[PDB]
Design a protein around this ligand. Structure first.
Ligand code: NA
Ligand code: NA
Length: 327
DNA sequence: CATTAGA
DNA sequence: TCTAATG
């Protein structure tokens, strides 16, 4: 957790490099398994050799470790930290819509900057257009103050359109959290579940609503069960307009909401820990259901849920207010 | 680990 | 269709 601090960090920088700049899924995949294990290691690594005895630690990394342990740095790490090319890809990538592949391509055309981007806005697709457009706001955190307002909006429509809707703003927001990255709306409706052959309109219907009123301002992607867009709060009595905010609405078959919802609300740790428990308690949890574990090895059969409670019960835990779904 | 775009 | 990107 700290005794292995730098080692793990160098390792991740490294891993990251292969992954992004180079197309080195393997090397990259190496660095991380390595960073995973040294992290677990209970002791202060004193040398490559020592490290080396570990699984995943080949000679390649050991070597790296000594140098860093030796001198407060690593050259390669230094060389890469310097390089404009690689530097360039690390940057472009921030653009929502821009991945590594695209990053490299742009770079090799000479697109390195933001401006560069604008000059060749033509070479960009919609998503990437909007990513570039809202570059600034997309980087900014959402205050809970704002969150509440937004939420309030979405909840109001959803209902106005159909009363039978059920929306849940998941995430950290849902976990109390003072700020949030974007907003997630868990959507479900009774007339939609596991089997009931869809109702795409069920999604569409509301998307449309949000837009009609101008909450939704852009679409990154709209498909039958997953919308990806941009939204924004009505800039009051002027002098202050709102930043454009990332947003994701998604249709869920009523018979899987609470799992979905439990799940999405995290925290990543709570899940696992919650997940790990259902296992002893003879279960199996995942993004959509909970199933009784059968001796033979495995076993199925989707236990029925009407609240985040039911699920708890099943595994006989204490209902944890999301506030405390912290870990 | 899945759903959407894209070309 | 593959492949890329976000979640
Ligand atoms: Na080894
Ligand atoms: Na990006």
């Amino acid at each position: 957790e700290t005794l292995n601090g730098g080692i793990t960090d160098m390792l991740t920088e490294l891993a990251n490099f292969e992954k992004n700049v180079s197309q080195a899924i393997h090397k990259y995949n190496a660095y991380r398994k390595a960073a995973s294990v040294i992290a677990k290691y209970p002791h202060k690594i004193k040398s490559g050799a020592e490290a080396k005895k570990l699984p995943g630690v080949g000679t390649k990394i050991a070597e790296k470790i000594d140098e860093f342990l030796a001198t407060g740095k690593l050259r390669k790490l230094e060389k890469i930290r310097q390089d404009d090319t690689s530097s360039s890809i690390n940057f472009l990538t921030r653009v929502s819509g821009i991945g590594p592949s695209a990053a490299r391509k742009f770079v090799d055309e000479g697109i390195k900057t933001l401006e560069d981007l604008r000059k060749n806005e033509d070479k960009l697709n919609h998503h990437q257009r909007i990513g570039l457009k809202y570059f600034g706001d997309f980087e900014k955190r959402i205050p809970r103050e704002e969150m509440l307002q937004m939420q309030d909006i979405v909840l109001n429509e959803v209902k106005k359109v159909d009363s039978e809707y059920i929306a849940t703003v998941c995430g950290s927001f849902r976990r109390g959290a003072e700020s949030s990255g974007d907003m997630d709306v868990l959507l479900t409706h009774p007339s939609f579940t596991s089997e009931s052959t869809k109702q795409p309109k069920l999604l569409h219907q509301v998307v449309e609503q949000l837009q009609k009123v101008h909450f939704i301002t852009d679409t990154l992607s709209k498909g039958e069960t997953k919308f990806m867009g941009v939204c924004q709060l009505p800039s009051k009595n002027d002098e202050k307009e709102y930043p454009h905010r990332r947003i994701d609405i998604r249709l869920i078959p009523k018979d899987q909401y609470y799992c979905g919802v439990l799940y999405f609300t995290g925290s990543d740790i709570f899940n696992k820990n919650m997940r790990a428990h259902a296992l002893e308690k003879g279960f199996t949890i995942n993004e959509y259901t909970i199933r009784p574990l059968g001796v033979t090895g495995v076993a199925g059969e989707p236990l029925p849920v009407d609240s985040e409670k039911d699920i708890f019960d099943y595994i006989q835990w204490k209902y944890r207010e999301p506030k405390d779904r912290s870990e």
